[PDB]
Coordinates of C-alpha atoms in Angstrom, one line a residue:
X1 CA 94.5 86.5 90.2
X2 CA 94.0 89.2 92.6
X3 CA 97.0 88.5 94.6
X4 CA 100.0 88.8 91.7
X5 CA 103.0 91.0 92.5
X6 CA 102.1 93.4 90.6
X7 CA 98.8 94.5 92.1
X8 CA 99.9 93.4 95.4
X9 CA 101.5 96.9 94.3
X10 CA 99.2 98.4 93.0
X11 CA 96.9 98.0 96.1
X12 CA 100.1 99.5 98.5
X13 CA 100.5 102.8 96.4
X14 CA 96.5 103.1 96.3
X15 CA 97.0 102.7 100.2
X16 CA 99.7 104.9 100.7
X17 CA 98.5 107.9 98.6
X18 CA 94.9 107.4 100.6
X19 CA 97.3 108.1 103.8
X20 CA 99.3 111.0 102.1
X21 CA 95.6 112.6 100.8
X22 CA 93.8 112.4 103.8
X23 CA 97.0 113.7 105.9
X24 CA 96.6 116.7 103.5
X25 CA 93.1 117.3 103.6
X26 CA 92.6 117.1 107.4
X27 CA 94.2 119.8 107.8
X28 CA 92.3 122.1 106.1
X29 CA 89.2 121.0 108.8
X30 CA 91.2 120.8 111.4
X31 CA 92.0 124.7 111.2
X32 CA 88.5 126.1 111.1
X33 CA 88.1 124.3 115.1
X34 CA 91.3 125.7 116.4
X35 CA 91.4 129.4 115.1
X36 CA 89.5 131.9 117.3
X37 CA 86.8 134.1 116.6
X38 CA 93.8 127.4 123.4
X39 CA 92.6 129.0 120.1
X40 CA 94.8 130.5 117.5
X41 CA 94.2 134.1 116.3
X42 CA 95.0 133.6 112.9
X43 CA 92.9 136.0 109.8
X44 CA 91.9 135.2 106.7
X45 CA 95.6 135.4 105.0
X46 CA 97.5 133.8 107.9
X47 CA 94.9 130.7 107.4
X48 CA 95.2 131.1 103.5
X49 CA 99.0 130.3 103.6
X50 CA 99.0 128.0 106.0
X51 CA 97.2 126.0 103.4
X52 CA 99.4 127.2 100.8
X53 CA 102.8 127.0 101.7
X54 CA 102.5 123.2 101.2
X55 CA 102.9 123.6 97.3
X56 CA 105.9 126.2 97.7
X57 CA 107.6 122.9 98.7
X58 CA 105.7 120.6 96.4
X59 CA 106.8 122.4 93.5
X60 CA 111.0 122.3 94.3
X61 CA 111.3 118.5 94.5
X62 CA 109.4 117.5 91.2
X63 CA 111.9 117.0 88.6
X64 CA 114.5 116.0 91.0
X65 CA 112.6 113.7 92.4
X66 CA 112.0 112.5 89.5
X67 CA 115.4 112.2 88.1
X68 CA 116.6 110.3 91.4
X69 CA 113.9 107.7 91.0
X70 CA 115.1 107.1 87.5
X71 CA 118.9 106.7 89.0
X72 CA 118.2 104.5 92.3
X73 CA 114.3 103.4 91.8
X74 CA 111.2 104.6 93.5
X75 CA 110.5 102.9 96.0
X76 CA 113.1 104.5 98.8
X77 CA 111.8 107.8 97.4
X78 CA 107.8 107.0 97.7
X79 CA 107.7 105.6 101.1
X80 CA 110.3 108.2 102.8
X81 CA 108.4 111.1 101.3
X82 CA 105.2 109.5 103.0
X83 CA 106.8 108.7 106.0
X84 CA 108.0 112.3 106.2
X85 CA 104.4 113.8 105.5
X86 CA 103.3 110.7 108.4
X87 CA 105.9 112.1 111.0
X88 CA 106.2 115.9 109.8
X89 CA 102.2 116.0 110.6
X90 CA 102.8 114.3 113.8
X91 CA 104.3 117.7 115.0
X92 CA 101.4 119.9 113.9
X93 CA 100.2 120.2 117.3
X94 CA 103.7 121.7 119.0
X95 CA 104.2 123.6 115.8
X96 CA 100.9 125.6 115.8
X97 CA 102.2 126.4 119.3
X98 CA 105.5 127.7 118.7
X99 CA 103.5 130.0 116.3
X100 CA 103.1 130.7 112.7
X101 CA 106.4 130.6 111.4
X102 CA 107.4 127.2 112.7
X103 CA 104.2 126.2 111.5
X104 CA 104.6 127.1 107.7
X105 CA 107.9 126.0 107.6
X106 CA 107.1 122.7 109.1
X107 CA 104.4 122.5 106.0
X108 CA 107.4 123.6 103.7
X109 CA 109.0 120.6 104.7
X110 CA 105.5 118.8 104.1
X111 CA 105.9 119.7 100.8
X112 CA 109.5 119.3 99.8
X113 CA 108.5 115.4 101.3
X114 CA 105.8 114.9 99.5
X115 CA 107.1 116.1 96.0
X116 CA 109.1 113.2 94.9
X117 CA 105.8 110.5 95.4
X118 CA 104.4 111.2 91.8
X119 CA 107.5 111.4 89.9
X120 CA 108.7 108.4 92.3
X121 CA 105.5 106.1 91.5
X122 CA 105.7 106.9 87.8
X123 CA 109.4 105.8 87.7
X124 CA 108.6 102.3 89.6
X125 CA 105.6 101.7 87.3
X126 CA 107.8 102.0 84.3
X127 CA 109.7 98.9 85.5
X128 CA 106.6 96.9 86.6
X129 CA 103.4 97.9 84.0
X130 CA 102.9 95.9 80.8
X131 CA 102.6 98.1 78.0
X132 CA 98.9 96.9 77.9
X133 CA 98.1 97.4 81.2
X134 CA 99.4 100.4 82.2
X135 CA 96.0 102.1 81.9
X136 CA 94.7 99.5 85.2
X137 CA 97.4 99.7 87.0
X138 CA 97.8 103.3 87.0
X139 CA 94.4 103.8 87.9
X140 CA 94.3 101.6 90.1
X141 CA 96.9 103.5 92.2
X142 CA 95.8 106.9 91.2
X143 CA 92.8 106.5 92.7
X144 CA 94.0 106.5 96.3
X145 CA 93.9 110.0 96.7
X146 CA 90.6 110.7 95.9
X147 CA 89.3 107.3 98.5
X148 CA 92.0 109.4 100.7
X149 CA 90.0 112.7 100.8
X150 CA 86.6 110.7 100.9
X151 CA 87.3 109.0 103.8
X152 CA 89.6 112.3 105.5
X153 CA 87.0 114.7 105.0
X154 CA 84.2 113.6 107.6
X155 CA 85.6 111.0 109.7
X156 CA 88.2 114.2 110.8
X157 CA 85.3 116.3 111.3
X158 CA 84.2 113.1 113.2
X159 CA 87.1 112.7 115.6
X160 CA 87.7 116.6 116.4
X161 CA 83.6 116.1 117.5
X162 CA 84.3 113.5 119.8
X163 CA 88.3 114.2 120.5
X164 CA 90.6 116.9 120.5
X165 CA 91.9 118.1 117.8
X166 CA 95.3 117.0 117.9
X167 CA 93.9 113.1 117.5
X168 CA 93.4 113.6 114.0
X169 CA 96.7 114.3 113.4
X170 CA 98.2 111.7 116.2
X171 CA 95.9 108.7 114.2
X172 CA 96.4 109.4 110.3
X173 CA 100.2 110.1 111.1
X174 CA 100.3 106.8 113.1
X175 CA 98.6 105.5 110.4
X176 CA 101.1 106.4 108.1
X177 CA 104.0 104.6 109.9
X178 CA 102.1 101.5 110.2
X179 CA 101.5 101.9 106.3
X180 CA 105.8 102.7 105.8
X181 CA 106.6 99.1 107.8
X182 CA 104.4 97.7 105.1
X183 CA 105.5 99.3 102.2
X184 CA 109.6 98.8 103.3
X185 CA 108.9 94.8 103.9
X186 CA 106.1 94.0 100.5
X187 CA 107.6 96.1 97.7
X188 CA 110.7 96.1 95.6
X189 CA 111.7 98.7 92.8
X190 CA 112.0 96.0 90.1
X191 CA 110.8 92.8 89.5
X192 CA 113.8 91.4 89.3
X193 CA 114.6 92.5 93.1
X194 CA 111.4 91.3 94.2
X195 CA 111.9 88.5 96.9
X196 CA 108.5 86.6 96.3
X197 CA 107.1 86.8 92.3
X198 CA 106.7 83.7 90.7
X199 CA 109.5 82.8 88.1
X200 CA 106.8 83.2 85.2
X201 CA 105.5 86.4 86.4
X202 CA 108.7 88.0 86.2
X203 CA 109.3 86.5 82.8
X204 CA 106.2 87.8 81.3
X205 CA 106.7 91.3 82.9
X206 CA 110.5 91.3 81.7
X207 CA 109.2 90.3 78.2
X208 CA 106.5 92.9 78.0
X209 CA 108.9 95.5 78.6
X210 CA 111.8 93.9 76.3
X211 CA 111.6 96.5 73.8
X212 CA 110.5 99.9 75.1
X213 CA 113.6 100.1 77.9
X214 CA 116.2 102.4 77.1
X215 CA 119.8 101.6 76.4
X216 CA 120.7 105.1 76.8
X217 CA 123.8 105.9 79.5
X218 CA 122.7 109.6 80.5
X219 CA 119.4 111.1 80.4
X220 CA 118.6 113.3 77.0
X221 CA 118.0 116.4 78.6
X222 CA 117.8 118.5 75.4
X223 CA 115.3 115.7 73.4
X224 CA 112.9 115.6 76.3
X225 CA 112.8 120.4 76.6
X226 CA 112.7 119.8 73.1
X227 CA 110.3 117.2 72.1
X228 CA 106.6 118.8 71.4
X229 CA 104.7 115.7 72.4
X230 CA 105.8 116.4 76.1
X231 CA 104.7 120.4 76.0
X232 CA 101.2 118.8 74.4
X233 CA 101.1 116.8 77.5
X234 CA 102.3 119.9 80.4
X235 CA 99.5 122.3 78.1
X236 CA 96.8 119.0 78.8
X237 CA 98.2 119.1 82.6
X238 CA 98.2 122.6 83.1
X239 CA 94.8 123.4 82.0
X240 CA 93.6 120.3 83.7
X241 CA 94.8 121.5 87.3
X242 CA 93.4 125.0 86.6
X243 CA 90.1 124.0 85.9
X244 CA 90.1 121.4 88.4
X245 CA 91.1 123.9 91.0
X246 CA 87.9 126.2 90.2
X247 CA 85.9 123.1 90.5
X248 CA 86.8 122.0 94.0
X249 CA 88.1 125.6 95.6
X250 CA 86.0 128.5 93.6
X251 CA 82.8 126.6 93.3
X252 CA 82.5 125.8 96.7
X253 CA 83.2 129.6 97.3
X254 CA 80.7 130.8 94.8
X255 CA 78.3 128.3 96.5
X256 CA 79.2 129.7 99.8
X257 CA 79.1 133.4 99.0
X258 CA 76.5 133.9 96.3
X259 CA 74.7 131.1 97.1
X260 CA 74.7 131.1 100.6
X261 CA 74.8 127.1 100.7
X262 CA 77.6 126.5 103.0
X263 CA 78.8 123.2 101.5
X264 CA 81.9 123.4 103.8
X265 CA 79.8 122.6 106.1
X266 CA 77.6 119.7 105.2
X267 CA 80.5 117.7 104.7
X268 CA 79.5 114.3 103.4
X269 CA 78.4 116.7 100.2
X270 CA 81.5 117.8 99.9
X271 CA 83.0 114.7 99.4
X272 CA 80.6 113.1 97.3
X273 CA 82.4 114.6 93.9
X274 CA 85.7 112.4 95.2
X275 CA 83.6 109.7 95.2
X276 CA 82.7 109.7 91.8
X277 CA 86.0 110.6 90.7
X278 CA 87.2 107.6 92.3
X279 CA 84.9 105.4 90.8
X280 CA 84.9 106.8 87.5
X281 CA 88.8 107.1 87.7
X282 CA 89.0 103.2 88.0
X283 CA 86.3 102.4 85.3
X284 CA 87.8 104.6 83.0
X285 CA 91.2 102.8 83.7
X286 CA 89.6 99.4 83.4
X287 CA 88.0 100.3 79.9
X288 CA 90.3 102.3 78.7
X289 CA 92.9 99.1 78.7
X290 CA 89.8 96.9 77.4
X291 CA 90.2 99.3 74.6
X292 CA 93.1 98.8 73.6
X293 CA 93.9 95.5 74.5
X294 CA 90.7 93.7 73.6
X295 CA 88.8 96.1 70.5
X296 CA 92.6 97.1 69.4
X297 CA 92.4 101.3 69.1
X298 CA 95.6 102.4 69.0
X299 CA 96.9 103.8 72.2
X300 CA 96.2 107.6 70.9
X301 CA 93.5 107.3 69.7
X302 CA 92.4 105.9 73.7
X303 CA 94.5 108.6 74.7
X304 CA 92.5 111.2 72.8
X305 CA 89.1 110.3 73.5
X306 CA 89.6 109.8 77.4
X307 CA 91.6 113.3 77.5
X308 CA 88.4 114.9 75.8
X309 CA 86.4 113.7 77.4
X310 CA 87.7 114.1 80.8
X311 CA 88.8 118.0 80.0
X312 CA 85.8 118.9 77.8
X313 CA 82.6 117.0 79.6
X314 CA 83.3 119.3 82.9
X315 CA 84.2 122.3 81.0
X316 CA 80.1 122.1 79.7
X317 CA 79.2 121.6 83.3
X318 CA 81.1 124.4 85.0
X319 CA 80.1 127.0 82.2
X320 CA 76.4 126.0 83.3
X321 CA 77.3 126.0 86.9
X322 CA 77.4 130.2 86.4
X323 CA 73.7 129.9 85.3
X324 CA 71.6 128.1 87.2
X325 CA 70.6 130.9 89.3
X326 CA 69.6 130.9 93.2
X327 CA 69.3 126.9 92.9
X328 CA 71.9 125.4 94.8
X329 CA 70.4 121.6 94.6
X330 CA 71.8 121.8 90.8
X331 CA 75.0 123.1 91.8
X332 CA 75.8 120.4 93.8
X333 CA 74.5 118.2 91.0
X334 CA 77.1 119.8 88.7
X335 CA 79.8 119.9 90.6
X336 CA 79.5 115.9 91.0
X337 CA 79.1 115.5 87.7
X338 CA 82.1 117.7 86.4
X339 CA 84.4 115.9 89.2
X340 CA 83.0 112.6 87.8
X341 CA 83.8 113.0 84.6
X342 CA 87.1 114.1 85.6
X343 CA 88.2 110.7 86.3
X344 CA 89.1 110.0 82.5
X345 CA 92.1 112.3 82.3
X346 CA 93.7 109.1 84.9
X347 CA 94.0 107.1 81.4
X348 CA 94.3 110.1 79.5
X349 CA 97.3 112.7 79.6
X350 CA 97.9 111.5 82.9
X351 CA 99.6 108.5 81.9
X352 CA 101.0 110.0 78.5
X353 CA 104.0 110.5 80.3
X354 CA 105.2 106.4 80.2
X355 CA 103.7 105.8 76.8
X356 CA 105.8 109.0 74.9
X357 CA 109.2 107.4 77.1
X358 CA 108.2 105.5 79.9
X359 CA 112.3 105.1 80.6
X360 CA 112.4 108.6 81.7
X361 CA 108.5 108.6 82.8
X362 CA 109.8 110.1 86.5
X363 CA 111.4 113.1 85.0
X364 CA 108.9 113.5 82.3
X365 CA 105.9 113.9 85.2
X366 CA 108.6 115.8 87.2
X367 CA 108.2 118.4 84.6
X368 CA 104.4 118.2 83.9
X369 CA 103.7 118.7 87.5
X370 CA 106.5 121.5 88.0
X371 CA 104.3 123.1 85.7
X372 CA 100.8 122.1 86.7
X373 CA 100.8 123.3 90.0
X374 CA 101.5 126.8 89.4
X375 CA 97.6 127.3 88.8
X376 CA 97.3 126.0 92.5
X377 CA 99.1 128.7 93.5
X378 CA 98.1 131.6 91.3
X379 CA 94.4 131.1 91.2
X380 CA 93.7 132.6 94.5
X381 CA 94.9 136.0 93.3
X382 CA 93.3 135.5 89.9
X383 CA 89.7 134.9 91.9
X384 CA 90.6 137.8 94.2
X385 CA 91.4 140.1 91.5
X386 CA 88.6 139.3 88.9
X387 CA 85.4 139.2 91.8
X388 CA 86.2 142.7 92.7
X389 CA 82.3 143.7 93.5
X390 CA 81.1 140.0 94.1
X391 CA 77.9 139.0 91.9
X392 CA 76.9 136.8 89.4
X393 CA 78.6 138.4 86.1
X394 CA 82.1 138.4 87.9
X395 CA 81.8 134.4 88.8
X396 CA 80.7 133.6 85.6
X397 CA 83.6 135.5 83.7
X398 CA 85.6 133.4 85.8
X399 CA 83.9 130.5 84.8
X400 CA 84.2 131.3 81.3
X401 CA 88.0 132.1 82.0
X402 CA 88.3 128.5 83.2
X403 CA 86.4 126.8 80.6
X404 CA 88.6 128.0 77.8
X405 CA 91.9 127.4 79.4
X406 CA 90.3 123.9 79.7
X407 CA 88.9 123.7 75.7
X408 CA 92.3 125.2 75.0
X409 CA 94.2 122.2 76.4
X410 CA 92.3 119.4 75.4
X411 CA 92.1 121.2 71.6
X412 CA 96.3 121.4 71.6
X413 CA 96.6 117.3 73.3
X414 CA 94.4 116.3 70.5
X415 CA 96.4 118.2 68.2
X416 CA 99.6 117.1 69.6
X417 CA 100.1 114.1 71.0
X418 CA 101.5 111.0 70.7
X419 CA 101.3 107.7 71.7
X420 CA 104.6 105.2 71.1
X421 CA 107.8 105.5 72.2
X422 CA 109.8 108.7 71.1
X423 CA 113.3 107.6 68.7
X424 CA 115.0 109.8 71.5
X425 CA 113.9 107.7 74.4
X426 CA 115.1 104.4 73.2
X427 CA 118.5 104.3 71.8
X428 CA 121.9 107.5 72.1

């Protein structure tokens, strides 16, 4: 039944990180209209961190987020970070006014909002997944933000054509609250404060859980820094984001500046690779829990293959991006097929984090993304650094650089990790 508590939430989180996504990539289409050459005279580098000072804030409130979801529940967490990203982005018009300082601060505060969703989310699913559909569920609510950035990306480009831009911000912010007043009256933290799941619902999600909850008193700080299967899962993560940030920031450059292609542009181009990984990022969830549910593989061995594939298939692609020459048409077609193959790692290492000790899943994907989105930040100097004279050879040693950080990681997640509950995570 489609309508069961749990995918009731399921559905809202797919919902609400659509809203969070597409606040967060309207922005980065909105700029281009208001800078000059009122209009904003803003260069290259005042643009550039205006973009980026959203992860300088991201990055503070992972693991405590994460550890404050696993005290007091997710929910509270979730929706006030989203409402603050809603509300916060309702100001962008008065703070691009007052200049760029209140401006990058008010993304700052962006960011430290929106940190604690992930960690949040992964500490209410670790109260409400069955062990043997975790891989759906997940998925299911994973996939948000890539629907998010499809739908964001031209109907923005849309609205500043026939609006101002300041409606785009006024109707995804507005958006966002009517989303919150939703998400405060439908969802609870636990089934067992949920005011509407059936009685045998709640039994059956109680009973699939029975044995994987932890009966610990304080969290085990030193187990968790210690444990190897979690730094298998942060190398996985890390290499993951880097190469995934080539593929949807560098690419588009190199297609822009060696190219000449101006995908940017086109729009509806540019969001076709979010399309695919949307739809290949629920497939891969639905078989990837047929898998092991139905065929019985063992969850790492599920784990495995998806994490291969989904780090090695685009690694193939992007290598092969650097030689197709002046033919864009096949650039494109790469780039669509890398960011569809990307979908797997949504039931690979990406949901490691509650099978390994899904009692402490919030603080373990604190960590992993405390560490995985330092390539977010540090790539643009990387790029800047490595492209000094701008041709072929230079992209394509980048390209190369990002293909083995990527072979790397999936090589030490094979090697490395696990899928059952660590000794550490169940009993003192």
């Amino acid at each position: 039944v489609c309508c069961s508590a749990r995918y009731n939430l399921a559905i809202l989180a797919f919902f609400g990180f659509f809203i969070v996504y597409a606040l967060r990539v309207n922005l980065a289409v909105a700029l281009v209209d208001m800078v000059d050459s009122k209009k904003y005279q803003w260069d290259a580098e005042t643009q550039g961190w205006i973009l980026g000072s959203f992860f300088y804030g991201y990055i503070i409130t992972q693991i405590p987020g994460g550890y404050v979801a696993s005290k007091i529940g997710g929910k509270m967490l979730l929706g006030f970070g989203i409402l603050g990203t809603a509300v916060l982005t309702l100001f962008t018009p008065i703070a691009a006014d007052l200049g760029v300082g209140p401006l990058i601060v008010l993304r700052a505060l962006e960011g430290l909002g929106e940190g604690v969703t992930f960690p949040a989310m992964h500490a209410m699913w670790s109260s409400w997944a069955p062990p043997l559909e975790r891989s759906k569920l997940l998925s299911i609510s994973y996939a948000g933000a890539q629907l998010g950035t499809v739908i964001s990306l031209p109907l923005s480009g849309i609205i500043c054509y026939y609006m101002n831009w300041t409606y785009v911000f006024y109707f995804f912010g507005t958006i966002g609250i009517f989303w919150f007043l939703l998400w405060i009256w439908l969802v609870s933290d636990t089934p067992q404060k949920h005011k509407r799941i059936s009685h045998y619902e709640k039994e059956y999600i109680l009973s699939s859980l029975r044995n994987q909850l932890s009966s610990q008193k304080s969290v085990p700080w030193v187990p968790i820094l210690k444990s190897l299967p979690l730094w298998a899962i942060v190398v996985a993560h890390f290499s993951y984001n880097w190469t995934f940030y080539t593929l949807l920031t560098l690419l588009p450059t190199y297609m822009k500046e060696i190219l000449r292609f101006n995908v940017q542009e086109n729009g509806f181009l540019s969001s076709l690779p979010y399309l695919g990984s949307w739809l290949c990022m629920i497939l891969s969830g639905q078989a990837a829990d047929n898998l092991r549910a139905k065929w019985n593989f063992s969850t790492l061995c599920v784990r495995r293959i998806f994490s291969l594939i989904g780090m090695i298939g685009p690694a193939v692609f992007l290598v092969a991006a650097g030689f197709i020459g002046c033919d864009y048409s096949l650039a494109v077609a790469f780039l669509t097929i890398s960011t569809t193959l990307g979908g797997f790692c949504s039931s690979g290492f990406s949901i490691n984090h509650l099978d390994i000790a899904p009692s402490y899943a919030g603080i373990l994907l604190g960590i992993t993304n405390t560490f995985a989105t330092i390539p977010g930040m540090v790539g643009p100097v990387i790029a800047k650094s490595l492209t000094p004279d701008n041709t072929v050879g230079e992209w394509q040693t980048v390209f190369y650089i990002a293909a083995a950080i990527n072979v790397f990681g999936a090589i030490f997640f094979t090697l490395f990790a696990k899928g059952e509950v660590q000794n550490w995570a169940l009993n003192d």
